[PDB]
Design a binder for these strands. Structure first.
Ligand SMILES: Nc1ncnc2c1ncn2[C@@H]1O[C@H](COP(=O)(O)OP(=O)(O)NP(=O)(O)O)[C@@H](O)[C@H]1O
Ligand SMILES: [Mg+2]
Length: 1141
DNA sequence: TTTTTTTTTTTTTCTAATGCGAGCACTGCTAGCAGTGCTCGCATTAGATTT
């Protein structure tokens, strides 16, 4: 191992950089990034300078990714500024500038990089896999559009239930008994193998044969038990004489007990072998049991039956391993198949699919696709690495030239074993890499904390109990030498262990006492910092200890809740950063549901009363009592809820809840009440979720259905449903040890560091092959091999949790006993991670623990006994509130301007079906119809196929169309067939501006003056409108240099042709107010012609208006169906002037 | 193709480990009996993580 200098580090091949915590592993990423962008280092430099898009960086968490991206951006900016100024105030940038040959070109490259920083290739492992799969779906063999699912619990449980149905159902009742004894159902079966299903499959030690079915194992075990029973049956009488004759202590083996045991074993042997249960007395008659208890130098009773019983009881009889193996294969297969069917994908599935692709035949090509894309890749937090990830990284970047690979990690921090990560693969990689580099100095914390840690981990030799993980002392940097933490004028020791009092302490008592002590100490720190006494000082500078800089690191959820409850008992604000609880699980969700349910149907008194009596409203009991008696108050409430329903129907969801909160003053009363701030935040969050979900759901009742559904089954994994932060003020941050990786905290607490657990399951790694091995049998060898790794993981977790703090870290210590009996004897602290380092891995009593603590204590490490904290709430000095006033609006905004059409302002062929779609189809027919050619039957048949009407109309409709085309027109006698494509314009769209507001009264008067149809009808009624007017003219055509306007109408006036006469057509025009319609159309056409036609005249060039009633068109009567009307020129001129100004 | 009624609640783990109490065989002390060492059985209590 060599000391590391970022400028001199060569970037070629594989390089491993390992160092202790807070030594600047992450900080070196930025320096290496800058070196890569500029291509600095000469011999140690990359052969060619690279771009932002060609550097890969892989981090463990998303937050770390964002942090690193931002910091790289900042560093690029600062280095560019330095290159432009040729001077800088930082030593790293100064050395870089000394190394740079040309500074102008360097600044140019840095500028390009800064501009491309949006495309920085900084991902996590799962994001990198997903992105490489999507960018190379062709080589990998995936689909081009893949979906992402975060939670596979439902698919997994469904596959397990399918396995159960297929296998456990057909079984006979006798094998079914044995299966039912082990697992009650698929729910319990999934619980055992849930961990093994996730990630790579575990090698099973001593797997059953492939052809062995359940019935074969059952028959084998039944045969063994039958043999033992028969051997007992044959020797049921000789054993008494054998035991009596031979010499064995009868104090250990009483004659009455012997007779009882013989009777029980005989009764069991005569019993039919229905189940695998064996009596306990067989343990007494084992050869080893007899050999253990016998006279010194005396005859020992020995019989072949005893040897048979000893061989039988040596290993448990069960079908567990076979069923577990079959399920572990079949459920995984089924899940993969279903996910392939739906075209979905998951994180573990992403990694496994990329690995499979690289391992397949085409993967070689895929390898180049990833290798050419990312020449250099830097993996951070490499200690947490799965075998899949290392296989991928090796396959891609092992031996190819012109491609570097930088592995940065600390094995002492490998704490994600539970998540599939492995330390043994890290050590494999460490063996496979030749070069090693190290960081010497700690830049994170005060020199006190560094010395404390160095002293605590130097107690024993090979503290981390792995030969490949040697511990060495680290040295603090010169910048932090001044750091101190002063409490009440006295400098506190860097690390303080709070020892609990007593000999034997239970787990629950330990948790309660330490939670209380931590709460009391945090309260004292806050009280002393509020008066400016307690200060975190860097030399002369200082600052008080806010409730934010204090962090409490916990291992489990229940632990964090135990901390938070006691911490809130002292009225101290705190928040738990690892909280995955869902909002809908709170009571506010239920209250909001009751409120919506009452608003929906205020008629029902029960639902309304239930919604009123919620804590959210804040009514008392006397309020509800008086309100259940007075009818007027109840009626007023019903009325306001009915109005809320109207608001809810019209404006949506959030407006209704907002009006309710305003009228009932819910927000003010909640903020006034103690604790109501969290309540109001949850209410607002639920309101936002309800609005988001009500946008998509069109029905109002569907939203209540959706809310009840979500309340019934809250999804904790959902990100949107995560509970928001209570307040933006200072909060004590409770964070788990795993989530605290790579972070930093001024003051740190570890209330329950001593607490541990013993691993019962047998899952370990072979010391030779370094492969994950699951032993479905409970052989104690496997259990010991697993417990050793558990202890190593606990030691690494302890190291991680200790290296977080900067100024001060406290931690609880107690003589924790995990065994009920022999509490007076040795404690179980030695098994705990911290205890093993305090007692040098030697079991001791409480006095021994206290003496070891006292011996360990020095200037940096001080111990104090833990006592019950004083129950006094933290007092916070309130602050006066200044005068507050909201602004008001002097000028109201105007909605006068708008764009409207005629519809907004207004607001056998005879037996043919009618409607909106039939009318649109009839119009679309003429839209693309050629008038100069006869109708084609195939075209009409195709249009009837499109519309879906009966083909029976096809012979008739064609004829009807010709009746339209050949029908004559106004006295000029124009036939629609006579119109060439040059003299026609179909569906012309027009825009007509209306500058002054259009008043219905000021127009209706003129229209009545110049048109009798308006005089017959009542006055026009519509609101003032200023803006534009849109419209679509059906047809415009010119004949004999005279223009016309044609409008199609398919309204079914009547059943007979008499309803299509002149008077009836005029009546229909007056009824549907087509008068104003054609008047506006004429104004539009007049303006368009005046614009386009040079030397235009209304009387000369205009020809009138023609309404064509399709169904009215009949060959028998020329007048029926067509209507012709010419607006007065004076009306047109006055209307134009009105609309113009 | 016509129509009437009615309002309330119920459940909750399991395994394991020990402490004591009762019974008994052995055995040493002054043939029986008290101590002792032991052992089985019933009741009581503790604990069950982490992206
Ligand atoms: N060369 C340096 N000069 C100045 N400060 C540094 C230097 N290297 C690291 N630091 C500071 O040291 C602190 C922690 O460094 P960091 O890069 O997080 O190391 P680390 O290996 O990531 N710690 P961890 O993530 O827990 O393993 C930060 O405040 C950095 O600014
Ligand atoms: Mg880091």
């Amino acid at each position: 191992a060599e000391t590391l200098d970022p400028l001199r580090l060569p970037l070629q091949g594989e390089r491993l950089i390992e160092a202790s915590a807070g030594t600047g592993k992450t900080f070196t990423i930025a320096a290496l990034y800058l070196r890569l962008l500029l291509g600095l280092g000469g011999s140690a430099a990359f052969p060619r300078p690279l771009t932002v898009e060609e550097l890969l960086v892989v981090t463990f968490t998303e937050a770390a990714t964002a942090e690193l991206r931002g910091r790289i951006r900042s560093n690029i900016h600062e280095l560019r500024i330095a290159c432009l100024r040729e001077t800088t105030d930082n030593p790293l940038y100064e050395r870089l500038l000394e190394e740079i040959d040309d500074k102008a070109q360097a600044a140019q490259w840095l500028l390009l990089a800064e501009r491309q920083m949006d495309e920085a290739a900084v991902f996590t492992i799962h994001g990198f896999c997903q992105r490489m799969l999507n960018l190379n779906a062709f080589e990998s063999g995936m689909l081009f559009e893949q979906q992402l699912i975060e939670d596979e619990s439902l698919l997994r449980y469904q596959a397990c239930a399918d396995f159960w149905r297929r296998h456990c159902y057909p079984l006979p009742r006798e094998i079914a008994q044995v299966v039912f004894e082990t697992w009650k159902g698929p729910q319990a079966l999934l619980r055992d193998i849930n961990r093994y299903l996730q990630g790579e499959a575990p090698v099973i030690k001593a797997p059953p044969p492939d052809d062995e079915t359940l019935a074969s194992r059952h028959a084998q075990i039944v045969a063994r038990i039958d043999t033992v029973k028969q051997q007992w049956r044959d020797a049921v009488g000789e054993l008494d004489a054998l035991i009596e004759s031979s010499g064995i202590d009868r104090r250990k083996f009483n004659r009455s007990n012997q007779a009882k045991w013989i009777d029980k074993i005989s009764a069991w042997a005569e019993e039919e072998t229905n189940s695998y249960q064996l009596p306990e007395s067989l343990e007494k008659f084992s050869q080893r049991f007899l050999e253990d208890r016998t006279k010194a130098g005396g005859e020992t009773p020995r019989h072949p039956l005893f040897e048979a019983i000893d061989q039988l009881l040596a290993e448990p009889l069960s079908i567990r391993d076979l069923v577990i193996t079959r399920a572990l294969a079949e459920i995984r297969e089924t899940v993969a198949r279903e996910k392939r069917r739906r075209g979905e994908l998951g994180f573990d599935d992403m990694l496994s699919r990329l690995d499979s692709a690289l391992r397949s035949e085409s993967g070689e090509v895929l390898a180049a696709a990833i290798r050419t894309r990312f020449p250099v890749a830097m993996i951070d937090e490499f200690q947490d690495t799965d075998p899949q990830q290392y296989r991928i990284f090796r396959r891609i970047w092992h031996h190819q030239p012109e491609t570097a690979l930088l592995l940065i990690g600390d094995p002492k921090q490998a704490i994600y074993a539970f998540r599939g990560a492995d330390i043994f693969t890290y050590m494999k990689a460490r063996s496979e890499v030749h070069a090693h580099y190290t960081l010497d100095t700690n830049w994170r914390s005060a020199p006190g904390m560094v010395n404390s840690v160095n002293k605590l981990f130097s107690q024993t030799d090979d503290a981390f109990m792995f030969r490949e993980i040697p511990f060495i002392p680290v040295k603090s940097a010169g910048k932090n030498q001044a750091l101190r933490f002063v409490f009440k004028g006295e400098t506190q020791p860097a690390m303080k262990m709070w020892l609990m009092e007593g000999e034997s302490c239970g787990v629950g008592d330990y948790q309660s006492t330490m939670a209380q002590v931590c709460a009391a100490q945090i309260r004292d720190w806050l009280q002393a910092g509020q008066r400016g006494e307690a200060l975190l000082m860097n030399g002369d500078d200082a600052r008080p200890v806010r409730a934010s800089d204090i962090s409490v690191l916990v291992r489990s959820r229940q632990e964090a809740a135990q901390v938070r409850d006691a911490l809130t008992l002292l009225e101290i604000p705190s928040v738990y950063l690892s909280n995955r609880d869902s909002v809908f699980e709170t009571l506010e969700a239920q209250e909001m549901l009751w409120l919506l349910q009452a608003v929906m149907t205020p008629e029902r008194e029960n639902t309304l009363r239930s919604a009123l009596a919620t804590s959210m409203m804040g009514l008392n009991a006397l309020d509800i009592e008086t309100l259940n008696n007075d009818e007027h108050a109840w009626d007023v409430v019903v009325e306001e809820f009915d109005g809320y329903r109207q608001i809810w129907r019209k404006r949506g969801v959030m407006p209704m809840l907002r009006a309710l909160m305003s009228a009932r003053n819910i927000a003010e009363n909640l903020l006034a009440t103690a604790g109501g701030e969290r309540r109001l935040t949850d209410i607002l969050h639920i309101s936002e979720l309800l609005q988001e979900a009500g946008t998509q759901l069109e029905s109002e009742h569907a939203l209540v259905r959706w809310l009840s559904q979500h309340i019934l089954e809250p999804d904790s994994n959902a990100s949107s449903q995560q509970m928001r932060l209570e307040s933006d003020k200072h909060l004590v941050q409770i964070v788990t040890i795993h989530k605290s990786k790579g972070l930093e905290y001024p003051l740190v607490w570890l209330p329950f560091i001593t607490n541990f657990r013993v691993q019962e399951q047998a899952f370990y790694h072979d010391r030779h092959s370094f492969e994950a091995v699951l032993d479905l049998n409970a052989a104690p060898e496997s259990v010991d091999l697993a417990e050793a790794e558990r202890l190593a993981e606990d030691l690494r977790l302890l190291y991680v949790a200790l290296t977080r703090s900067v100024w001060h870290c406290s931690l609880g210590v107690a003589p924790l006993v995990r065994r009920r009996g022999d509490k007076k004897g040795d404690t179980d602290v030695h098994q705990s991670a911290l205890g093993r380092l305090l007692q040098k891995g030697e079991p001791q009593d409480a006095a021994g623990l206290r003496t070891c603590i006292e011996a360990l204590c020095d200037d940096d490490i001080a111990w104090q006994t833990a006592q019950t904290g004083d129950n006094q709430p933290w007092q916070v000095n309130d602050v006066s509130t200044a005068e507050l006033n909201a602004k008001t609006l002097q000028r109201l905004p105007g909605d006068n301007w708008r764009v409207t059409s005629y519809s907004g302002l207004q607001q056998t062929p005879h037996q043919f079906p009618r409607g909106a779609s039939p009318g649109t189809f009839l119009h679309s027919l003429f839209e693309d119809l050629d008038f100069t050619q006869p109708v084609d039957p195939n075209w009409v048949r195709e249009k009837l196929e499109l519309g879906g009407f009966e083909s029976q109309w096809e012979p008739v409709l064609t004829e009807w169309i010709t009746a339209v085309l050949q029908a004559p027109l106004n006295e000029t006698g124009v036939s629609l067939s006579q119109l060439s494509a040059r003299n026609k314009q179909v569906e012309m769209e027009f825009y007509l501006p209306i500058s002054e507001p259009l008043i219905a009264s000021q127009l209706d008067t003129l229209i009545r003056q110049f048109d009798p149809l308006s005089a017959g009808c009542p006055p026009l009624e519509f609101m003032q409108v200023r803006g534009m007017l849109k419209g679509f003219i059906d047809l415009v055509f010119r004949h004999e240099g005279r223009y016309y306007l044609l409008a199609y109408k398919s309204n079914w006036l009547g059943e007979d042709s008499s309803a299509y006469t002149q008077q009836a057509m005029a009546a229909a025009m007056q009824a549907h107010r087509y008068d104003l319609q054609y008047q506006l159309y004429t104004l539009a056409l007049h303006r368009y012609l005046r614009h386009r036609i040079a030397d235009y005249d209304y009387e000369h060039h205009f020809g009138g208006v023609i309404y064509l009633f399709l169904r009215g068109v009949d060959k028998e009567h020329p007048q029926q169906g067509i209507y012709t009307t010419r607006p007065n020129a004076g009306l047109i001129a006055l209307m134009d002037e009105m609309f113009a100004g």
